[PDB]
């Protein structure tokens, strides 16, 4: 009942995954990822690429496909309590989305930044490129889409006096979309 710690998943799910990645590149950025023309780079770094692309296409396929087909068909009548339960879960999506953006656009980007400063590149596919570009960006644009789609297919906003608040709660989580409605110009 209300908004659950699925939101806990949504936070840790990246954090474990990416902390594994940071370990992985920390240990192989040196030994393997130094000289691209060496066979250890093929196995530990190049293979990594096609592993993720496949996985990304696949997930993004099942993930968007999932939600779209499970789109709340007749939503004409579904309680205000769900129109609350929902633009909570929706928000969880948007939290995951932001967390994802954080890693992709702050963390892994300014890292690439440091990486460029310390090794003269051998490919357009440095460790930190395999990670910053082809693992990070896809992940968070996928999270992006999901958020959008969830909302589009789940919430019908997608076609004292504590008082003057308390009851402004029939079609509130309009707010939901003054904020997807203003990450808006915030992002670009």
């Amino acid at each position: 009942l209300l908004d659950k710690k699925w939101l806990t998943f949504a936070l840790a799910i990246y954090t474990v995954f990416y902390l594994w990645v940071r370990w992985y590149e920390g240990v192989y950025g040196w030994s393997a990822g130094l000289d691209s023309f060496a066979p250890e780079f093929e196995t530990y770094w190049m293979n990594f690429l096609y592993t993720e692309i496949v996985l990304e296409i696949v997930t993004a396929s099942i993930l968007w496909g999932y939600l779209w087909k499970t789109r709340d068909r007749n939503l004409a009548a579904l309680t205000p309590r769900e129109e609350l339960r929902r633009n909570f879960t929706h928000l969880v999506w948007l939290v995951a989305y932001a967390w994802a953006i954080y890693w992709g656009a702050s963390y892994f980007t300014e890292q690439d930044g440091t990486w460029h400063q310390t090794i003269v590149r051998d490919t357009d596919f440095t460790p930190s490129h395999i990670i910053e570009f082809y693992l990070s960006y896809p992940i968070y644009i996928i999270t992006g889409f999901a958020a959008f789609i969830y909302a589009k297919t789940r919430l019908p906003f997608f076609a004292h006096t504590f008082w003057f608040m308390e009851e402004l709660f029939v079609a509130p989580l309009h707010y939901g979309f003054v904020i997807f409605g203003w990450l808006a110009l915030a992002v670009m």
């Binding site: 440091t114 460029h116 310390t118 968070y140 308390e166 904020i179 808006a184 110009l185 915030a186 992002v187």
Partner: protein
Amino acid sequence: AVRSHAEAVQVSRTIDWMALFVVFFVIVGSYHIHAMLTMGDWDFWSDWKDRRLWVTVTPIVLVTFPAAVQSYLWERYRLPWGATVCVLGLLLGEWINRYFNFWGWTYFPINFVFPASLVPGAIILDTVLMLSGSYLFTAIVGAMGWGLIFYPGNWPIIAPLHVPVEYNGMLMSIADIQGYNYVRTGTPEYIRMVEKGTLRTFGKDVAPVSAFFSAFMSILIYFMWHFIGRWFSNERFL
């Protein structure tokens, strides 16, 4: 449904937290991409924090988000921390990186790769727009402030780096020596783009829907135009 004023006050609180997070990291994320993209940095090195370029570009290229999120948060919530929220965003972003990567991964001393200090400016902006609550006003004196305050704002940090030494027969300041000792390389790829120019916008923002209400109003990156208010700030140096 939903029940009481007791619960209402409750969901609107647990909302505030979730929202604040989203707002905040999505700032950190795109704001840091901005700073990065436009300044391959002066910010990175102590020996690039000079009197002309560093002092000129940094406050200029940096008002954007403050200015924009300023015109959303104050206009629509009367929340006056628009400016500072961005700045804090960038700073955490840059630090976690300077620390865990810049030093953590590749071993550059923190006293070298530390970022520029930014809070003062943002406070000036936020408060000036709060009191005397006209944007036009903030744009002229507020940005003016942000601009000017910048360098003096970093002076307590910068200064001890600027004490002179005769290093093998040449005058050099500490900071100079730092960059001379701690070998970096070239510059060396840039077009950190295709999906950054577009794709990763036009999936984030369709915000739109086809429904309008797009607070995609940044005519308050007129509020930018305090570059002029800024670029005094450098003729400020000698």
